[PDB]
Amino acid sequence: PIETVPVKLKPGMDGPKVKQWPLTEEKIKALVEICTEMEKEGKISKIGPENPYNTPVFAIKKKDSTKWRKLVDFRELNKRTQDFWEVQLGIPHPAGLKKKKSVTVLDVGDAYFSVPLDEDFRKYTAFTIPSINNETPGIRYQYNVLPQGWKGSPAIFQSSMTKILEPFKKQNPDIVIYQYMDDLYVGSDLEIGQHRTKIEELRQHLLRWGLTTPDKKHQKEPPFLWMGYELHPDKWTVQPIVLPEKDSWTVNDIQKLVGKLNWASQIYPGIKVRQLSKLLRGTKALTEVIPLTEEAELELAENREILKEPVHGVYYDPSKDLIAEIQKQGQGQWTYQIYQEPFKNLKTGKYARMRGAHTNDVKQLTEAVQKITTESIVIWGKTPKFKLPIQKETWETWWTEYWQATWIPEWEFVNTPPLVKLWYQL
Amino acid sequence: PISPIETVPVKLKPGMDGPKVKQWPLTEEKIKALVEICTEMEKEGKISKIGPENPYNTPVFAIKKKDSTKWRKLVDFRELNKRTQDFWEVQLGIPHPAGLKKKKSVTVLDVGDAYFSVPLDEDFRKYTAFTIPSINNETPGIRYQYNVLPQGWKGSPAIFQSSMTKILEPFKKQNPDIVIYQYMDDLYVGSDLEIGQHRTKIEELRQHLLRWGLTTPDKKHQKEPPFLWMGYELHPDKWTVQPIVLPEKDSWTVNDIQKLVGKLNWASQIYPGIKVRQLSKLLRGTKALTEVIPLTEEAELELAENREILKEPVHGVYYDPSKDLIAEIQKQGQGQWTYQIYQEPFKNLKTGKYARMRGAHTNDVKQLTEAVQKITTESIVIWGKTPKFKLPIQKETWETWWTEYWQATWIPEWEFVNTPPLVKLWYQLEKEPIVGAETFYVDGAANRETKLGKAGYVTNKGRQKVVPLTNTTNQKTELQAIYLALQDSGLEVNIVTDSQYALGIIQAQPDKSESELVNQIIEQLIKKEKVYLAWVPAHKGIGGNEQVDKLV
Numbered sequence: 001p002i003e004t005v006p007v008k009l010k011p012g013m014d015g016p017k018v019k020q021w022p023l024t025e026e027k028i029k030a031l032v033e034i035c036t037e038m039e040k041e042g043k044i045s046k047i048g049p050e051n052p053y054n055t056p057v058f059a060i061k062k063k064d065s066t067k068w069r070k071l072v073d074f075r076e077l078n079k080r081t082q083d084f085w086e087v088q089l090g091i092p093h094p095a096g097l098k099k100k101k102s103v104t105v106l107d108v109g110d111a112y113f114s115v116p117l118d119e120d121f122r123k124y125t126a127f128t129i130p131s132i133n134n135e136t137p138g139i140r141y142q143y144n145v146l147p148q149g150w151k152g153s154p155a156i157f158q159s160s161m162t163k164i165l166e167p168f169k170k171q172n173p174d175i176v177i178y179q180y181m182d183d184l185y186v187g188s189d190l191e192i193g194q195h196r197t198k199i200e201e202l203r204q205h206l207l208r209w210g211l212t213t214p215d216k217k218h219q220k221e222p223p224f225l226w227m228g229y230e231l232h233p234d235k236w237t238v239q240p241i242v243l244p245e246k247d248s249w250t251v252n253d254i255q256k257l258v259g260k261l262n263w264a265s266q267i268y269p270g271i272k273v274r275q276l277s278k279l280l281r282g283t284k285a286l287t288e289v290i291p292l293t294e295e296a297e298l299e300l301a302e303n304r305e306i307l308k309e310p311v312h313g314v315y316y317d318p319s320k321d322l323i324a325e326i327q328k329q330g331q332g333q334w335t336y337q338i339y340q341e342p343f344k345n346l347k348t349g350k351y352a353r354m355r356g357a358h359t360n361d362v363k364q365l366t367e368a369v370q371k372i373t374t375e376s377i378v379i380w381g382k383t384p385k386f387k388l389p390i391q392k393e394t395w396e397t398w399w400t401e402y403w404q405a406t407w408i409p410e411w412e413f414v415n416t417p418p419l420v421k422l423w424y425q426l
Numbered sequence: 427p428i429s430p431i432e433t434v435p436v437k438l439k440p441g442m443d444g445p446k447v448k449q450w451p452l453t454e455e456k457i458k459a460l461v462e463i464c465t466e467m468e469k470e471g472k473i474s475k476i477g478p479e480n481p482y483n484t485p486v487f488a489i490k491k492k493d494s495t496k497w498r499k500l501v502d503f504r505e506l507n508k509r510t511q512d513f514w515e516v517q518l519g520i521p522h523p524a525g526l527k528k529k530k531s532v533t534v535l536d537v538g539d540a541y542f543s544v545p546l547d548e549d550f551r552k553y554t555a556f557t558i559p560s561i562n563n564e565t566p567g568i569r570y571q572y573n574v575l576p577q578g579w580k581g582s583p584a585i586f587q588s589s590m591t592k593i594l595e596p597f598k599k600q601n602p603d604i605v606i607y608q609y610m611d612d613l614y615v616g617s618d619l620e621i622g623q624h625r626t627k628i629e630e631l632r633q634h635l636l637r638w639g640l641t642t643p644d645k646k647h648q649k650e651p652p653f654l655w656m657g658y659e660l661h662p663d664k665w666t667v668q669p670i671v672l673p674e675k676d677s678w679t680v681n682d683i684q685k686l687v688g689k690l691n692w693a694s695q696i697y698p699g700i701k702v703r704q705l706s707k708l709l710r711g712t713k714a715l716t717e718v719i720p721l722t723e724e725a726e727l728e729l730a731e732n733r734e735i736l737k738e739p740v741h742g743v744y745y746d747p748s749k750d751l752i753a754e755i756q757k758q759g760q761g762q763w764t765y766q767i768y769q770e771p772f773k774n775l776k777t778g779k780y781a782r783m784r785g786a787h788t789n790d791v792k793q794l795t796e797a798v799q800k801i802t803t804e805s806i807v808i809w810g811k812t813p814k815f816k817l818p819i820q821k822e823t824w825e826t827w828w829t830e831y832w833q834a835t836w837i838p839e840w841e842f843v844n845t846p847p848l849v850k851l852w853y854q855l856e857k858e859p860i861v862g863a864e865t866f867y868v869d870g871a872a873n874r875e876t877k878l879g880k881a882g883y884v885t886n887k888g889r890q891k892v893v894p895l896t897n898t899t900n901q902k903t904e905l906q907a908i909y910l911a912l913q914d915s916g917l918e919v920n921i922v923t924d925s926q927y928a929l930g931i932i933q934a935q936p937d938k939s940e941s942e943l944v945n946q947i948i949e950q951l952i953k954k955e956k957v958y959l960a961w962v963p964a965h966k967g968i969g970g971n972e973q974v975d976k977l978v
């Protein structure tokens with residue numbers, strides 16, 4: 001018996017017909033291998049010309065076992081198969097998760113491969129391994145089982161997940177377990193050693209009683225976040241707006257300051273530039289040094305005060321989507337703001353790695369995006385839409401060179417205005 | 427033509443039904459031509475007389491072939507095509523010559539009756555019914571239905587292709603050596619075997635195709651190198667574009683032009699230096715295919731250069747996977763770049779151009795980086811890898827421009843080619859205010875209805891100035907006030923504006939613009955020794971700024 005769950009597309013919607021991006025011979029050879037095996041294993045099947053649908057496929061590395069892995073871009077299919085499964089009242093995203101000392105992320109995507117996919121729905125999961133220089137028509141396939149990356153996979157497996165995790169949760173009542181797509185987020189306030197030990201009990205539990213398989217990302221090699229994918233949200237900073245501390249102020253310094261403070265006024269109501277502007281009265285050389293008045297600091301220092309405590313009257317609305325803007329700050333540094341309505345930041349932040357050996361803007365941006373998305377998932381339960389400060393073509397050419405996640409957010413390309421100044425640091 | 431290949435299942439779109447288009451009777455001879463054609467087809471299995479039951483109908487017609495003893499049946503499935511399900515779209519792209527690899531011998535095989543050789547899904551036949559009218563308004567007329575892929579149906583191209591692929595699958599596996607390209611009803615077979623052994627395999631392939639209902643050419647090939655293929659001419663060791671011919675006209679129409687550019691862009695693949703900026707600039711204004719267009723001085727000066735280049739023939743070479751890919755780019759003139767990709771000195775795989783500004787204002791570095799991107803994408807498509815770049819820019823130049831640039835860019839490994847004109851930054855703005863430099867507070871304003879304006883400045887040294895402007899905009903006066911300050915200052919100047927717009931343009935350090943005013947500002951910036959540009963919130967009591975705001 002093949003107990004497949006009936007699935008359908010959103011009303012009045014047709015399957016996705018997205019074009020395959022041209023791929024390097026290297027990535028093509030990898031895909032051919034991976035698919036030849038999945039086929040032999042019954043996970044996918046070759047299809048004929050009567051199937052007109054298509055979803056983009058990519059080849060990435062989960063950071064180097066020198067293994068390759070297929071990454072299907074089901075962003076389009078997800079939007080037509082599901083913002084309606086039972087997408088709003090099962091187990092939504094838990095709130096204590098972002099307060100835990102440790103949250104470990106484990107990939108349970110391999111479970112799905114056991115469950116057969118609904119017959120009438122398969123057609124919609126078709127993809128194409130491209131050919132070089134159009135020499136031959138691409139190799140076409142469709143799925144016979146729940147695919148990793150499709151948003152219906154976790155939903156259909158849900159019942160089975162909650163069933164396997166039951167015993168484990170029944171004995172560890174102080175461990176929050178939140179699932180998002182192909183991943184499980186396990187958080188606790190234990191000590192690193194206990195926390196890690198406890199994750200290991202979970203792995204082995206899935207393995208033996210799931211006969212499900214979570215990969216063993218053994219612990220750290222380089223100094224920071226390596227075992228499963230070990231986060232520590234209770235230690236997540238906020239990058240507040242900072243106003244320079246001054247020795248000697250020049251007309252030009254105060255002008256810049258007044259501009260930044262003025263801009264800030266659209267967020268912090270208490271900010272005032274009255275006693276600060278008075279020092280500019282007259283048309284002076286930008287160099288001219290000027291002593292801060294007595295009422296100045298009584299205003300300036302008062303501003304630094306307001307600009308410390310993130311604003312309020314900002315609540316997360318689940319019907320609206322999150323938007324993340326990132327700005328290149330130079331020196332391997334990057335700032336970002338997650339929001340839903342302009343000038344209502346739910347969060348602000350920074351990301352930086354400049355002088356290991358190997359890094360470039362695209363790689364940096366690529367990691368920043370995955371970092372923001374993960375924090376985003378942990379804090380709100382969804383991935384945001386990114387406004388990337390890079391050129392469409394460039395991003396499309398290289399993002400898969402450093403992508404490691406199993407999910408892919410929405411993104412658009414923008415041209416940052418000189419407000420990087422109003423967000424930069426030190 | 428009797429293929430035993432399993433059929434591909436077909437369906438009409440959801441809810442729709444077969445087509446019921448009435449046949450409007452015709453000529454005495456035309457009906458007779460059909461009956462004779464269809465009787466011969468019936469004998470061959472291609473079609474079958476259907477019962478009085480119910481097949482729908484599609485209009486039939488018959489034409490004089492471009493030879494007069496034989497006529498041609500012709501079905502207009504337009505209606506069936508509309509009710510038929512979508513299929514996986516057949517290869518819209520085409521293999522590019524510079525991507526093919528060197529082959530000792532290449533044979534071209536034409537499949538005959540391609541479509542009529544592949545069976546049609548049994549259940550779908552009924553919708554292909556048609557009827558040849560009667561003696562003349564008397565007898566009912568004969569009803570026929572297709573049993574094979576009809577010459578004008580929607581699913582024929584894709585189903586044929588897929589069937590061909592399946593038929594070739596076993597052969598290509600018993601000959602990992604032979605390479606076969608499928609394109610429509612043609613098959614290009616190549617190999618690095620001895621002419622006698624090659625001719626051997628070809629005959630094999632042929633017999634294989636034949637045992638699957640596919641007939642190939644008799645002299646084993648009506649293949650005579652060089653092959654004229656899709657606007658290309660392929661020789662055993664080189665390739666070129668087919669004879670390019672530019673028409674000389676007195677009155678050019680929108681249509682005349684578009685056709686010119688199109689041909690020019692096609693020459694661009696292998697003829698270095700082709701340009702089409704001006705001829706194109708002069709094009710899409712509006713879309714009259716027939717609205718005569720007056721040839722611009724530049725457009726004719728450009729067309730002239732193109733003619734000269736096309737005078738001497740050029741050729742491209744084939745790909746050698748062993749050797750690697752190299753791309754070289756050289757600046758031309760005014761947002762125009764040309765490039766060539768090669769493996770060996772003096773042997774081009776292909777060439778190309780990049781003339782896209784991506785904005786009102788830009789600079790060489792940013793355009794150079796984009797050209798690199800277009801080439802990279804093309805290289806991946808044609809060869810499956812990225813080439814090593816040789817660019818007219820030194821590491822310092824590019825290094826500087828991006829550490830400062832607010833956007834994220836990237837370039838595969840590259841090498842500096844010292845062969846002017848070299849790409850460079852013509853001016854850099856100070857990152858801090860100058861000390862013994864007069865500070866200019868500038869402002870511009872315009873009437874949104876009268877479109878009259880003002881531009882001026884007030885400096886710390888006590889100088890003031892205002893200049894009247896006509897038919898202008900708020901944003902335009904803002905740039906003009908800056909231009910004004912630059913004109914009245916020394917080799918070093920501090921400028922303060924309240925215009926984010928003018929800030930954004932200049933802070934982007936452009937060396938060329940579609941704006942006349944911006945190019946003048948740029949000329950001034952180059953003259954200057956040190957320029958520091960600053961911004962302040964308008965109408966906020968900033969001394970300097972308030973005084974000048976009231977002035978203008």
Ligand SMILES: Cc1cc(C)cc(Oc2c(CSCc3ccco3)c(C)[nH]c(=O)c2I)c1
Binds near residue numbers: 527528532
């Ligand atoms: C009409 C045509 C189109 C294409 C896309 C390839 C082809 O034959 C080829 C050719 C070129 S065809 C001309 C030729 C090759 C040798 C002698 O004459 C090359 C270089 N390499 C190959 O692998 C094959 I197959 C023939």
Ligand SMILES: OC[C@H]1O[C@@](CO)(O[C@H]2O[C@H](CO)[C@@H](O)[C@H](O)[C@H]2O)[C@@H](O)[C@@H]1O
Binds near residue numbers: 018019076396409411
């Ligand atoms: O990368 C941009 C490019 O990707 C496509 C698919 O080829 O669309 C994807 O990315 C969009 C922006 O994030 C999504 O809206 C869409 O869901 C996803 O398929 C192109 O449409 C787009 O130009």
Ligand SMILES: OC[C@H]1O[C@@](CO)(O[C@H]2O[C@H](CO)[C@@H](O)[C@H](O)[C@H]2O)[C@@H](O)[C@@H]1O
Binds near residue numbers: 766772774
């Ligand atoms: O290594 C390439 C080197 O050779 C030159 C001539 O000295 O270029 C030749 O070959 C190119 C393509 O193979 C042609 O586009 C070029 O016109 C031809 O002179 C140098 O230009 C180049 O540095």
Ligand SMILES: [Mn+2]
Binds near residue numbers: 869904924
């Ligand atoms: Mn102004």
